[PDB]
Amino acid sequence: MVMTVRVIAPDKTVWDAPAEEVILPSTTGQLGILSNHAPLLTALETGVMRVRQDREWVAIALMGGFAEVENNEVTILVNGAERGDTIDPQEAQQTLEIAEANLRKAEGARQKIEANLALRRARTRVEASNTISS
Template identity: 50%
Template sequence: MSLTLRVLAPDQNVFDGSADEVILPSTTGQLGILTGHISMLTAIDVGVLRVRANGSWNSIALMGGFAEVDSDEVTVLVNKAELGSSIDANAAEADFQKATSAVAGMEGQPASAEKVKAQQQLNEARARMQASKSAD
């Protein structure tokens, strides 16, 4: 028996298939989902969803949203998502370094919209970089 996983973004169906195991980046930490999991709804943080299917692991960078688990079906609704295998690892690493520098340059400054935006860009760049490396 396996799980049915659907990862949906506003502009695309990112993943729709069977999975043996799913690890979700929830706002309260990593959640492992196996067949027979209790029904639940959880908020998804910016991070990497990992899915094991046919003995191999794949990664999907998620940019926040919600996940529902019900009767061995996992539905993930997110603001944006990218398959790790479709992310250019070198570009993702460069984006991460750029975002890290931007956040470091704002250290010690009072809270502002620019600082929050820079931190969000850093979180997204980190997720993309991690997903691209997991796809190797």
């Protein structure tokens, strides 16, 4: 009746929310994953995708990974991602501070990238590990 997309990481699982239409840039440039969309595998690079639940929109920021849909079942195997809704103020200031220091003397922009995905996988790992402990 609808689409079902779920994000997953090599360190743990993210979540599995519903959907209706997925539009985002891919290898060929344009990619459209729907619920009725037959079972096919695809690849995606570091970027963000726009999810269409039904009436509202939901965009997620995930690094380099792989995407594959099948029978209303999408699998995003990214090596570290993050949701725009799960963003904190301390984080932005943290990544900005460490970044400035990295480029200062440490490695160049390459350092910020490595640390970017690192924290991404760490955050999801924490929320996935201690999601709910009674």
